[PDB]
Structure formats: C-alpha cells, structure tokens
Amino acid sequence: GMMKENEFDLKNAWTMLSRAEYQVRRAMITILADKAHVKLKNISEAGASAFKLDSISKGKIREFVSKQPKADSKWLNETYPTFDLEKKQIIILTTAKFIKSYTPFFEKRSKAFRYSPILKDALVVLDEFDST
Amino acid sequence: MQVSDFSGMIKKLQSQSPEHALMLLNAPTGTGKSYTIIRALCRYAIKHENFRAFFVTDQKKNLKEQDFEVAWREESGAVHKAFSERVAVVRSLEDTVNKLINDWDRQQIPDLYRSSPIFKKSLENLGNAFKSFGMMKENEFDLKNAWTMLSRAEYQVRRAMITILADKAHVKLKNISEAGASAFKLDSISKGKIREFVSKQPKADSKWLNETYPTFDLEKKQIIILTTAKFIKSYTPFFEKRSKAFRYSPILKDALVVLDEFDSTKKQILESAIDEALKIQADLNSLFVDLSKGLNKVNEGQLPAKLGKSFTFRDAFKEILNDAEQLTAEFKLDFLYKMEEQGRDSGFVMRVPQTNWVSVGKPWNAYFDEELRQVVLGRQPRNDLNFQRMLPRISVFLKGATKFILNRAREYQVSENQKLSSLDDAMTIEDACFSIYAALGLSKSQAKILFSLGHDFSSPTKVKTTYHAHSGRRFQQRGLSLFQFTNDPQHDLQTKINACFFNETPERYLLNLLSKANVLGLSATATLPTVLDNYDLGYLREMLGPRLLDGVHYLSDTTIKEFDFESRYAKQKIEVKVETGIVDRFFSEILPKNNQKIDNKKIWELDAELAKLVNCIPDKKYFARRYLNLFNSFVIFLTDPSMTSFLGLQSLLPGADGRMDENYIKETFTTLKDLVGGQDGVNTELRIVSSRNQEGIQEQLSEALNLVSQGGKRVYILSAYQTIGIGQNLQHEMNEFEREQAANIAPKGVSKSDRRQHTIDLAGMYLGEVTHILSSNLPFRMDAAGLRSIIEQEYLFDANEINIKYLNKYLKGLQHQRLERHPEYARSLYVSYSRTIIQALGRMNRSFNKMPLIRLVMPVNVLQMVTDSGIDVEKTSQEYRCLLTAAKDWERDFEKPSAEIAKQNATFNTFRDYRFVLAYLQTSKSWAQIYHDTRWFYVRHPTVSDKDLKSSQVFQQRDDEFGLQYLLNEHLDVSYEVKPINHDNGQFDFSGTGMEVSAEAAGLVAMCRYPGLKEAFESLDIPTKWEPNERILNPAQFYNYRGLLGEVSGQFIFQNEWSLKLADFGKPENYELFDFHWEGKVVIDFKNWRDAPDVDTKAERQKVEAKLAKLQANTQREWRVIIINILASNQTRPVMTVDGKILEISGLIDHQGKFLLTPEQKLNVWRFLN
DNA sequence: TATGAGTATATCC
DNA sequence: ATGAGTATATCC
DNA sequence: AAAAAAAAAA
C-alpha cells in the first residue's frame, strides 16, 4: 500500500504480496494436513519449495473439511473460494478478474479463467454488457 | 614503520607495469600498517597524477574515510585539492540512499537542488522507497524486488539532478536524450560541459555533489575506497541507467589494489561467487544444441565477415565443430530427453574433480527409445547412452568452446576499439562476448551461463619464456558442476536438465585480477597457512612464482626488531595470565569458592533461572556451558580493582533467542554485580556492542570507552567476532587511575605527539569459541550452504589435508543426512581457529600504555583448538604466545599426516589422470604422444631432482602435472613399501606393507641378467638402478613404469628368441586394445606381473574377448591373441582355449634371467604364430 | 496548414 | 540416518 | 593458429 503510487514498481510489490499470501496458504495447507493425517511429508520433504500434492490427498482434505463444523468451514470457503472450485455453482467477480487468472488453492501457479475447464457449458452473465 | 617503506612498496609495484605482481605484508597489529599505507597512497597520488589506487576492505566500519581525509589534508602542500575530486568513496545503493535522505533531513543539499520542485518530489519518492526497502529486509526473495524499486527511485533522483545541471549548462537534454521519456543518452561533449560547470561551481555545491556521487567523474578519482562486496559487483555510472562491473571496467587497468583485509577477503569473494553460480542456470541439452547450431552457422559463412573471417581460419574451430557433431551423434542430443516421474523426488547429480555423485543413490540411466523417438531417462537398468558420461563430457565441451569464443571476442573487441575515435565509450570484453553470443543466436540467459564458464581469463603469452605456471590442484582447474532434472506441464514433452557450474574460486579471481592490476595485501595474518579462511598460498605461489613478492623486504631491520614484544613486556614487568574455564553444569563452579560465602540459595535460583531459560529453547546441556563461561568471564571482571576495560568476544551476537538471550545476560550481570564485589563492582557497567542496535558500532564503542576515559567507570564490552574482531580500535584515553597504574612500553625513539602514548589498551579479554570454521548444515540441497560445504571439502582435499577415503565417507554421509566428524588432523581448521583468535587478541595491542597484569579468560576448547603450525609466533603478540604456552598440553603434529595424505592424494590424482587418458586416447592422436612422453619420462629416471622435473618437455608443455605427480623422499631413499586398499580406485596406504616400489621389480634383478637386455637399456638411456634423488614415482606411476620396462624387455627377448619382427597398429579408434600385431594374423599383448595369483579368469577373458571382438568387427579378419608374462617362479605352460584362438603363457625368463621355453614350446609358438 | 478541451476502476505480472 | 552451535555486504 | 580433458560404482 505504501508503494501504490507508481505503476512500474507495482509489479514488484504485487510479487511480494503474492509470495506472502502463498506462504499463508502453505501454512493453512500443512495445518489441515496434520489435522487430516495426510502424508504432508511426501510434499513437505519432496517439495520444500514447490509443495505439490496428489489428487487423493487433497480429496481427503476436502472431505475432512466437509464434515468439519459449520463456522470454520464457512470461513474457509468464504475467504478461499478456490479451495474447491468444481463445487461452486455461481462465481461472482469483476470483469477485470474474469479476463485475468485465478490462483488455485493447493497450488502456486495461477490458472487463467479463459482456458480453464470451468467455463465449459457455463452461463456467463455480463451485468453491464456495453461497459465490458 | 615509516611511510617511506610503503612508498618504496608502491613504486616497486608500479614498476611491474606489464606483469602486475602481488605483494603481501605480514605485520602485527598496532604497528602502522593502516596508518602509513594511507599516507603513502595519498603522497603517491599527489606526486603522480596518473596513479590510480583502490582501497578494499570487507567491513565498511574499516573503510577509514576520516583517516584518508586527514592524511590527504596533511600531505597536500601547495595546491590543496578538495579531496573530493581526487579521493572517492563508492558506497552501495542503500548507503547512498541513506546519505541522501540524511542530507535532505539536515538541510545539507546545497539549495540548488533544494529549490527545485522536481528534485524535492523525487526525494520524497526516494524516502518512501527507502522506507519500503527497510521494511522488506527480512526475506531475501523480497530483497531483490525491494532493491530494484529503490534503484528505480534513486535513478529518478539522478535524472532530476541531471536535468537541473543540464539547463544551468545550456545543454539540450531532451534533444541529447529524446524528446520522450526513458533516454538521457548524452554525448561526451554535453557531460563534459556539465563537468566543467560543476568544476567552476562554488566549492560547497561541488563538494556535496562529489561526495554523494563519486561516480559523477570516476576518471578523475585517484583513490577509490570501497568494500570487497562492492568491488566484486558493479558501480552505476552517473548519467546512465545500466551499471558497469568493476571486473571489466577500464578503471582497473594498471591500477594498484590495496586489499587491507587480505586474507579476510577470500571468504567474501567465495560467498559471492557461490551466490552467482546459483543465479545462473540453463538447460544443458538446449544450451549445447544452440551453441552447436550457432557455430555451424559461423562455418557456413552466415555471420558478418568481421568475426566470421576470424573464426574460420583456426584449426581449433574445425576441431570444435567435429567434436560438436560427434557428441550430438553419440548422445542423441537432437532428440528430447524425457524423464518419467511418478512423484518421487529426483534429487540432483554432482560432479566434483574426484567423482560423480547422486543424491538418491541409484544412478541415472538413459537409452534411445526408437519407437517413441525419445531419449528415455530414469532409474531403469538399461543405459545405452552412458548418461553419467554424457553429463561431464558436454560440460567439458562447453568450457572449451566458450574459451575459444572468448579469445575470438577479445580479438573482436580490440579490432573494434580501433575504429572508435573518442575512447570514452569503448566496448568491454563482456560486451564483446555478449555480442558474439547474440550473433550466434543464443538467448541472453544462455549467453550469461556460457560467459560465466570462464570470465575473461585467457592467460599471458607463453610467459615470454620466463616462468612456467604449473599446479596439481584439480579443483582450482576444473571446479564442480550440479545438475537437477525438472518436469513441468508447460514443457510436458521433455525433461529440463538445469546445470550449475562453479569454476571461479577466489584464487582464480585473484589471479584474473592480477592479469590487469597490481595487488598489495595487508594484514597480521596475511600468510597463515590455511585454505579455509585464507587464499591457497600454495596454489598462488605455484601459479605466480616471481610475481608473488614479499613486503618485509622493503622494511628496515629496526622495524622487525620492534615487532618483538617478549623483551619489552619483561622489561616493564607486564604479566599475562591465562585462565581456562573448566565449567560444565551449574554456577557454583564459577563463583569464587573462597570463604566469603553469601548464601547457598540465591545462586540456586540463579541456576533455576539458567535452566528455565535453556529449557525454553525451541539440544541443551551445551548452551548452559556457554552461558556459564561468559558469566565466569565477567565474574573475573567484577572481582578485580583493575581491568578498567574488558572485551568479551563470542561467535554469536546477543539477541532474542534463548541460545544467547540479551536481557537475560544483562540481568545476570546486574545480579552478579550486586552479589559479588562490594566496592570492586560498584564502578562497573556492561555494554553490548552489536549491529542490532539503532546506532553505528563506532558511537557504541566510543560511548562505552568514554564511560572509562571520562566517566570513571569500568566497562565490559561484549560483542561478536564478526563485528569488532578484526581491525577495530578499542583503546581509550587514560584516566588518573590508569595513569598511576599502567606501564609504558614505547620504544626508544618515539615522539610524544603519538596517540599511542596517550591511550591505554584493553586490560582483559574473554575469548569465546570460534564456531563456524567448517559448515554443519545438514539438509544437503543445491543451495548456498551445500555448495559451501562441498567447496570447503574440495579445498581441504586440494591442500592435502583429507584423503579420498575421508571425502568418500563424507559424501556417503551427505547422501544419508548423517554428516561425519570434522577431520582430526586437517591443519587448516586449527590454523583458521588460531587466525580468529589472533585477530581477536590484536584488539588489545593498539597502544603503548598497558596495565601491569593482563588476564585472558577462555574455555578449554579454545586452548585445545589453537596451534602454532606455520604461524611465526616470534612476530605475534605476547598475549598469543602466553596463550600457546598455556595450551601446550594439546599440541598436535600435522606434518606427518599431511605427508602421508599428500602421497595418497598425488597417487589418486595420477590414477584419475590415467583413467581419463586411456578413455580419451581411444579416439585421439596427440594425447597418445603425451602419454608416450610421460611413460618414457618415467622410465628415463625413476628418481628425479626437483629442478630436473620442473624443466622438461613433459612438464613445461601441459600447464599442470598430468601424470607427473612424483612423491617426496625426505631421506632420498631408493625404495618404499605401500599397501593397496583398492587399486580399482587408486587408493593406497603408505604406512602398510602389501607391495614394494623399488628397483627389484625394475631391471636391477631378474631383468639385467639377459644377454643384450642391459645393453638395450644403456642404449635407450634407461638407468639400471634407482639413484638416490629428491622425488620418486608413486604407485600409480610405478605401475606404468614397470609395465613399460617389462614391455620393452619382453619384446626385445621375444625378438631375440623367436626371431620374428612384430608390427604396430595404425588405426586411431582402436588404441589401448592390443599392444602390437603380427602380419595381419595375430594381436599381441604384453604383461608384467608377480607370480600368478588366483586371478579371476572369466573377467579377464571377457575383457580380452570384447576387445578381440571389436577388432574382429573393425579389421574384417579372424584374429588370434597372445598373453605373455615376463617373470615367474614355476613351470611355464602356454594354455590355449579349446578352439585355439587365445594363448596364455605365464613367465618367459626365470629370476636368473634365462628363458624357460623348450624346443617343444618353441615349436608350438611357431604353430600358433601361423 | 490544419483540433479538441477527464475522471476513474481493477487485476496479474 | 548426528555433528555441531553466524555475522557482514550488495547487485540483479 | 593459444579449446578443454571425458572409468564405474558408491
């Protein structure tokens, strides 16, 4: 926020903010991993930077948070919609975000909305069509 | 020591204009080293207007800006130059920004930039950027981006200043730059006008501009003061956006570089080198393919004639193209390498001059899947491409090709600089190399990695037949390489082999610097023998010879006699007392157990507090000893009506963690002060001099010592070795107590105006453990710590301090995360420990007044670790000598294990050289000549004098000691005995008994007993007996020696007896397969061995039949083969295989030199010969 | 030689 | 899968 | 007409 004046250095500040947010996400990932008994070690040792997982481990995490109490799972889903995007029936966003990418949970490289399979057969409602 | 001595040193160094010698000076601290070098540099700069010098030191607290200003003021006599246009201080970007902000806050900007609104806005933006940079200093990933933002802000400030100066000089900036924005590319004339204007400007304005921006006119600066870290990196010129490296700048040509912390610089340089090596990585396959493609474009004349006509006329170019084609065909590098992972970590592969290394055990294999049209890489047993051979071969090719391209780029730069009229915008060697690489079609990253394989180092010119630079240290010559395999979904079709090469050790950087500038190295420990915290002086002297000068040759003997202190200390009855701390667990052991017992409870909750603090650490039982040693030290401090100044140095700075907790130490000190010492401790205080405080170390030290000089107190200064352990002044002005208590040791013939006559040195020092001599990081990954670890071990191996056994054990431990103990008899470890201790003890030798009794307190480990091996204790401080006399109970012997390790390492290196040369001689022609020459050198004289070995056609032609690693005979013996451990790996033990190297296996016995054989030896100039001389062959060399001797003798006797003339082969790709041939019918192989053991018949037959089969496929004939032995002890029996194609004869002549081949045998010989 | 004449919004690199 | 116990400096 | 140095196996 201190460096929102110039745009040339906005890229670097955005990069630092993204790295910090990714660290927060990694902390949450390892918390849920130790709370779900999942072999975080596979990642945590073979992935002490990249931190990749497999489908079954994230599925176990998702089904654990599914049966979790209402309040905490509610906060997690509200703040991190990308935690499980293939279950969201409605996705509300700005067109500036729609053109750009979204950063999935359990991952660091962002994925563009344009090529993602989530748009296939979806219905896109442009609330101000001409202004878009 | 007088300034005339350093003037003589400087003028001697400047007389080496085309050679650029290196001069080193050992002088104990507190002798004038830094006082007089500054005066000498200033005086020489004033007298000679074309003299340029650099003053380099590791820590900016040792830059001595004020000392340079004072010396310049007192040296200039008539003109009185403002010292800002002659002497410059090149600060980092952060320090420049800090000075700018401070000047802005103190109204010190000279009202010309202040009045402008553009400048003010730029300064406000710079202040915000500096605040952000300070906030983001925690994570090093954000450090790069914060630094980039700060650099952009500083550049905007510079642009504002440029516009302000341009309009005042009527320069059309915009027109010179660009009506638009990003530009400001001014011509030489405009900036010349600007420089003229500031030259005629009022003095205050010019002084501020020149101090803040020394790079405003960098050519006028005669002395340039900067840190080692800044010297390694680049400086940003004024008027420009891109920074220019000091390394390739024309500012260094014929300059004099004064490294005031040689040898402390090496580590810094090393660290920087490691970081740079990790920044630059590229896919090896694509890099090689692109370079090959570019070179082929050069061949077909598709590049401008300027470089094309210089590439093509050299035979090395044709050879490089041929090697590129052969390597592309051999390793299938045209195709994609795909490495299938199911998710398991791949680790990485290391290549060190001794071996390959895989971090996950199973070696990597690669074959060509023809159906897939890919190269499958993985852990499968199938290895049809020799991947572990592919990785280093491509690296060797890249290194050689890049050296060729560097030579061509040097030629191109020299030719292009002729065209330029104003030699102010000349292109550097780096620019020429980048232009060549870009013209070849390589990317910018590929150009960076190819250029870093060797940085503009191409040697001199056949040394003009002066001195032969030779070295047997393999790590300095080959470096090391790292490879990691990466799979990404965005390049799903292939696996990237990211490569990381480390070649520029600090010694190589220093040699490259010496290729263009004189270097003067100054410290009290400049020549301590150690390769961990000092340059490899052995390697430096090997590669420099006469160019490695000595400084003490330019001092009067009075100064050297003044270096002594054991006489002056005795004459004034100064007594040094070493107190070692035998403390393990609890605090009653440090309290004075004399019968003034206060309470048996208060110390118990003191122990409880200590245990509580230790337990709250996120190993224990060791931090307690550190705390107790420190507490014992300042108990000793608190119980003496003396010792007005005490310094306690550790290897750790007090902070927030429990392992060394700051406020806990403070409260412990206060409790001990009110618990021990009634009137002794009331006048005491504690100061923690640290970089974590909100003010510079200079004022912290100044106020801590003013507490004693003026406050009438007794201070305990606690800090770390890395903070104020080197080159820091800790003396203070005396008080009445010190005046009436201290003693003076000033030599007869010293002035009263000297500051050393009005100050008093420290009266006591606590020497904590020096902890980080060798790395201990455990998770071994491809990062800075792992590289530092591997490089330290390679340095130890080069200096003959660890053998291949210990290195293999260490690597195996690293594969398992089970690091081994430090080597017990590695001299460098103890010498580095001693170096830190010596530097620490030099901080209390900066004055002539000393307290009558000095107390040095340290734990027992410091006593056990220090040593005197290669350290001239005669010219060291008396405190260190007393410490050594106290530590004499643990003195080690390093000469013996070093000698045997040197023998083992020389043998191992010879064996590795020969393992390489056979495989390469497979497909070479000249290296056959080198191998022939080396073997004949072996047999012409097994024992050779040192000068005779150094001056030879085989030693003067190779630039290293390939195959020529002779042992050392301290007794000039003619024989020795060695027990082989693993002859497959070339490992030998020179204390065991399993084989004899002497003339008994030579022609002396059982070989000269043949008619005409001794005549053949005397005709071929092969001595019959090993004459006692200096150096003797090693077991790896003795193998080839006896093999060639047996070859000659057996072929001679075979020709004498069977009366047949054999012929040699003439096809290059089938060398080292069979010794000779016979009439296109037979291939003949000769052997020299002991009595026949229970040798593995099947492996020998498999190998000989494999070479036979490849010769069958190549010669288009069916061939026989003969295996022949020269000496035996029983009945000879030539046994053939059932088919009858292979002959095996064991022993030709007996031990009496007469053959054992009867008429029957003979005839069979004829029958097999046909 | 020749005109038209802002403020504001949002996200990744 | 134990041996051993850090601070200093500066460009991308 | 000044490119280097490339065993297996652990």
Ligand SMILES: Nc1ncnc2c1ncn2[C@@H]1O[C@H](COP(=O)(O)OP(=O)(O)O)[C@@H](O)[C@H]1O
């Ligand atoms: N004529 C002199 N010769 C040498 N040192 C002097 C002289 N006059 C004063 N000094 C002081 O003596 C001290 C010796 O330290 P110095 O020589 O700078 O470091 P070193 O002895 O490590 O080279 C310095 O602090 C310097 O200011």
